[PDB]
Amino acid sequence: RYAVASYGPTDALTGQPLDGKRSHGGLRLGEMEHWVLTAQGAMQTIIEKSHDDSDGCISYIC
Amino acid sequence: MKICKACSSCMVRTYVDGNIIFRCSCGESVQGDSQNLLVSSKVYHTGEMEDKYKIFIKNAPFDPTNCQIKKDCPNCHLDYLTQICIGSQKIIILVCRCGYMSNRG
Amino acid sequence: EPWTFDYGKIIKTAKILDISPAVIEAIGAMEGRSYADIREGQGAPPPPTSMDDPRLMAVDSAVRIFLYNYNCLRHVSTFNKPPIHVERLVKHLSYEEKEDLEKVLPNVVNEYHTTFKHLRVTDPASALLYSIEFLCISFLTLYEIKEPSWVVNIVREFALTELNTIIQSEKLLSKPGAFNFMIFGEDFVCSGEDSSMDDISAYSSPGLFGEDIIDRLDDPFSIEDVDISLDVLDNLAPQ
Amino acid sequence: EEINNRLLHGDIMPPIGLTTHDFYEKLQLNALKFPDRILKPIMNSINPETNGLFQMVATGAKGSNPNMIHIMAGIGQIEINTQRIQPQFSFGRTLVYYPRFALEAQAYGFICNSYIAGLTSPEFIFGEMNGRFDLINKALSTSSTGYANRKAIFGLQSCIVDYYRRVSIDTRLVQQLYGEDGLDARQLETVRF
Amino acid sequence: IANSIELITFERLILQWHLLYETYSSTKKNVMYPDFASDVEWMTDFLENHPLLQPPEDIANWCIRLELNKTTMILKSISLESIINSLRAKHPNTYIMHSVENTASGIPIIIRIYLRESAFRRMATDEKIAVNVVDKLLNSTIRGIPGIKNANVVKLMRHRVDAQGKLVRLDNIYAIKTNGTNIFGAMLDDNIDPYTIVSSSIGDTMELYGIEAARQKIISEIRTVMGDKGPNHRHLL
Amino acid sequence: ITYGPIETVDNEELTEADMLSFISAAVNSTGLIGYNIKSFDDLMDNGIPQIVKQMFNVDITYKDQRDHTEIDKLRESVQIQFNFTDVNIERPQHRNYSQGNKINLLPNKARLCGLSYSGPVNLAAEVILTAHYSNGRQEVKRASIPPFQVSTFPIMRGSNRCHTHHLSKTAKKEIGEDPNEPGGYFIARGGEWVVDLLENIRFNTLHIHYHTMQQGNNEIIRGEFISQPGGAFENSSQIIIRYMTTGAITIEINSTKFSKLRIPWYLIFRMFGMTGDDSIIEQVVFDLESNSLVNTFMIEILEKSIHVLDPIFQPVQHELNREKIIQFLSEKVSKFVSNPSAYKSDENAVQYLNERQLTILDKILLPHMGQTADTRVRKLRFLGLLIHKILLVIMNVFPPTDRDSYRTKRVHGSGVSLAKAFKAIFNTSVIAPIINGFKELLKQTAFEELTQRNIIEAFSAALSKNTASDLNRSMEQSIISGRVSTQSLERKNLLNTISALRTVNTHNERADMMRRVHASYPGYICVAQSADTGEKVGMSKQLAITANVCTAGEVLSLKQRLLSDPAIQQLADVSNKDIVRKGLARVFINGEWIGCCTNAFELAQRYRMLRREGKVVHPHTTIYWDSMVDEVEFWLDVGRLTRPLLIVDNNIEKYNQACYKAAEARKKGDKDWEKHKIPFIQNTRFTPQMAKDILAGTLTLEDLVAQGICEFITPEEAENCLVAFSIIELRKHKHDVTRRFTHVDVPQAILGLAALVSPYANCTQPARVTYETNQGRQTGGWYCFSWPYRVDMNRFFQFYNEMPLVKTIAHNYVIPNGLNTIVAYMIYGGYNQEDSVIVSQS
Ligand SMILES: [Zn+2]
Ligand SMILES: [Zn+2]
């Protein structure tokens, strides 16, 4: 069993949480979960989980 | 098959023109004739039965793993007989250690 | 009709070739020995004791090389491009002479192959001795032909050069003499027992049938294209 | 055994398109099918008003009729890719326990005993071959379905219903109407005309 | 009709064939294979019986001899003349000779097909192109629609409208189901309805019929692959 | 040694519960673990010394000098030959500062500190150095290295090199170990690792497979052959005989000295002599006077094969001079030759190339038939036989080899895998540093300056400043990562440990067929035990309950015995023509075709009887007689999977005599021929008294194999056996002349240890048995009895365990883990739906 809060170790490269419970942060919404959420037309849970609870950043384009 | 009488090497056919003459790398020729006229052959349902399984059929009476039937052997009057099923045709051949063959091999 | 070994023909052949008879009698038997050892005749392996002796095969190969070269010489007219030796030997002859060569030069192959096989299956040592005797007989009976003169010169040159190259090859198969190993262009030279530079990739024995063959398609048993995490693969259990 | 006897006299003539071996295999597969009569002894020894296993099977709660027949009456014929056990052990031997060119039905996967009666050693081996084939297929399922599903998903993912209820890729049409009726798949009822 | 539509290739009508380096321009002596020298008794009987097909002078020196198995010859019931006409029509580079369909049940029907000089028109060895010729002859279609490996009669379950307007469902309808798709040959044949040809292959439907028929065929194939508890029809659409 | 008449045996009271006694006897004899321990012991006793001494002989010449001294100006080449002949492994020792006190390292101490249970290897070498000057000058320098040790090889737990070898259970408890565990694992960096059994194709066997995968479509049927010159530690060489779509039969030899170069078969044949194509064709097809259809087909195929061209070997295709072909191979396959035109003028260079080429070809081309030039013709005969077999398969006379069959498979564990890893690692991590150090001191120190003492520290110091592998980090990395099957020792319970020690791994339609239950598994591989999830299914096999793994037998003793038999005509006496004319049957020992017997069945029967006696032929030898090809194969190599099978004897001789007497009475016309016919009787000589003795301990499997009651049957020989699956079936066919069995099985012998834990398993669906074997290895319980001393990770110890109320034979050897819970099969509120359980809180 595992449960993680909104803070924890984040990957140095991608900014994403680490892998699994052993690294004290993670659990994954892989390709299939994104397909399912899109099929439901979520796009606000996808925003939340993939950006706010993951490597969220604000790019700037000229 | 044709082997050079000099250096014992394979001889190419080289059909020229109405007659076949064999050429070696050393140059000797042998004048193939009559029989050598055949080039290639293919006969369907051939290469099995009495040539493919001759060893196996010969050894079958002495193989303990072969199924045996309750049929009298005409040659030696042994009560039991060795039974074989061969090929896609499921040809049943009955053998014996005496030498009986059921005339199926 | 019987046969027996005649050492006199071997001695005559060695004299004509100005080398010791120990070299002629040791054809196919100088492996692992130096030529200086061959000339003295010492260390000669005993007569072959079984049909499996590679010496019989070696001497038969020598006789076969001789007969093959002689057959190229006999039928030069039938070659679009004859090999180097015959072309060097026959370049001065006429086209009519080249065609007549098929008629003039004797058929020296005789019944060699069949009776050699019979001897080898029946007696190996006599088979080796007969192979050497037949090689000597063929070489001299081609040498000691007398008529006509032009074929005499051609056949004498042929026999000398081809027996010389046979003996030279047999000496090449023998143990090398002392020499510098610099010829081969590398900073080092291996050996026949080089456990130092040995492909360790083969030390790990190929204990599988189809190793060289390469499969590139996706393995139909992997999770490479499926997306599940560990301890969540338990959901893929039976039922 | 009658089919085998006809084979002993060479009385089996295959139809055109099938060899004697394949026709013999088909004939034996047909001859060893379990008749529907097999339910009679099972149902005679079952009290349907109180038998828990039968009430589970009959009401559709769990299990099927073949499970009940296997448990109580007999397994019958084992099939691996709609054919009996091929003699893989040796030339003409299905198992070490059976003679070469064996003609009895038991040698090729016929299980006379039921699960409750207990399976013998070769019957258990044949059942294990069948079960392992099932496990292999189940394990193949995840991988093959994942490959095909990902390919299909990336083929179709761009198809989005637009404001005209057409299915369109970017702006290029894929469909004039979604199901050709424009209806969600969750809002359909089957009614007779 | 199923038997008629099935493809019957020449290789299936032969028990053995021999490629020989001999010719039969007649006039000259012979030069014959030893075991085949007995053929002369009918080689000349063919010239007597068929005086309109004398051996051409441009015959090559490459003959292939065929023996026809009468059991499968009468099983599928092909006349020898039909075989000979199919071989002759499909090949003008060979001069066909054959025995007589005597129905003797003891002597086999022999066809000797002699290569012509025009056949050796190819950059390749004469023997090798002759060996290509025999293989092509063994592949030549004799009867049936090409690519139709099999054909089996299956009763179908179909709906029809009666004179009273009732939609009756007929089970007596019979039609054949083949292996291998060649829609074009099926349309050509007259015993088969051309407008009700159904093929399991999407490619042949695309080529023959068009893209709408190909789309419907895709739906049908995906549906029959789906099984019983398949998805909705709009997903297949 | 005649036996008592089978008609007088009484077995009617022999029940299945008595056959369980025979199963127990077999398990006790094999020990259920001892194969790996004894394999490792044999490794460190016989293999590693032979691997270092015989196989590792160095001979390399360097070419670089310093242009200062006139001796250094007249010198170009220096040749060094050093070979170790002294080696031993002593038990692990702990020394803190690596020397001094030299106390014995204990396994618990190694585990606690993260140490390694490794022992030092003391080596001594004879080093011979020569420098080859110009103008034929040569001097020799000889050095004798004192016995020294720079290595530590990991030592398994339980071998005689382990300190717990013959320790008593009380003394094991004192040393802090587990009294009941058998060992079998290596203690590396504080962790226990088990080298699993790796299944490998059988060596010295022609594996023929069609390439029907249909990729690289140019290729056709390929018949490969891995040739091992002797024991399992030897350097094996592989030859691959490929039939191609172009008609070419090309032989590719892959070995350490030389690999990956496709060569036409006639070339390989004629560089050994016999350059006449007639002789080569005769060797392949064994006879030319017979026409046949088999001979005609092979003859035409070989004619096409020789006639067709080859791209790479173009110059020598028609070269009838074997010397030119040898030189071509030497310059194409030998390294260090970058100038083809350089050697074209030196005679000595060509002589050396030819000598080295003949040496490598002798050692590389079918080494198992010999490694001296006197056996080249028999090597050619065997190569012709292999080509004949492949082409015979091509004619559809025979089917391709069965990849999944266990007739041609061997389980190599611990000894063999570590032997090969050791040879590769030792080669690199010893030769490369030593050779580079010798080259460096050569570059610096004057050669004639080196004294006997100087070379000694030259050799010792070069293998002292080494940290690349040290052999220890490398051996540990091989053991951890893993052709050395490995698995972290998962201490879930005792059954998990044992099953890990009994796991057979592959390390290789191929995905499907290689996971099915093959028909050769029964008796040797647990038909039930396998994985359940993902690709692991069918990947880890398990040994059956009675199956063990044989060790290398007396190959030479049996070979000499066969060669002394009057009825075996050696290869020298019989030629291929004599083989076909008389229909002689080939005799093989370990794949080495020696001799030809007149009657294969008679020879096999006689030697099987002799093995049954046990004094003259070891019981573990495999005597497989192929009735299809009329061959007798004797096998004594390691990795064979024997199991003990009770022997069924009958009175077929007396039955035949009575039948013939009845026939003569019928011929004489007497109607009383019935009284002259006797009933056929077949039985096993196993009596209930032997079962009771087996349980009583007065009789073991050794006494059974000695008496001839039972015998060990390998899969190869199992194909020659007709086994009754139970004593019940033998009793049923006790008077049936149509079911003359050769052995009687015990049905519990077909299941593994984990599968036998399931009670009434045959009443269950077999797939459920498989998931039980999966789950029987995961249950918590008394995994180890020394748990307080160990520092374990993710290990669960269950206080209470109970013997099952319905126990099985698998609990006679493992400790039950679980309780006899009273379970009500009922619906209680729907909280146990879909594989849930309602547990009593109390
Ligand atoms: Zn020639
Ligand atoms: Zn008889």
mmCIF file of C-alpha atoms and ligand atoms in Angstrom, chain B residues 73-78 80-81 95-100, chain F residues 660, ligand 2:
data_model
loop_
_atom_site.group_PDB
_atom_site.id
_atom_site.type_symbol
_atom_site.label_atom_id
_atom_site.label_comp_id
_atom_site.label_asym_id
_atom_site.label_seq_id
_atom_site.Cartn_x
_atom_site.Cartn_y
_atom_site.Cartn_z
ATOM 1 C CA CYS B 73 1.906 -65.171 -37.404
ATOM 2 C CA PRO B 74 1.535 -67.482 -40.435
ATOM 3 C CA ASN B 75 5.257 -68.227 -40.689
ATOM 4 C CA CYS B 76 6.073 -69.228 -37.113
ATOM 5 C CA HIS B 77 2.625 -69.538 -35.462
ATOM 6 C CA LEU B 78 3.579 -67.101 -32.713
ATOM 7 C CA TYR B 80 1.325 -62.194 -31.087
ATOM 8 C CA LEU B 81 2.326 -59.909 -33.944
ATOM 9 C CA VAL B 95 5.868 -57.779 -38.765
ATOM 10 C CA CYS B 96 7.427 -60.562 -36.725
ATOM 11 C CA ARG B 97 10.837 -61.496 -35.383
ATOM 12 C CA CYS B 98 10.613 -64.709 -37.409
ATOM 13 C CA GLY B 99 10.681 -62.729 -40.661
ATOM 14 C CA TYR B 100 7.010 -62.401 -41.608
ATOM 15 C CA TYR F 660 6.415 -73.000 -30.777
HETATM 16 ZN ZN ZN G 2 6.601 -64.904 -36.990
#
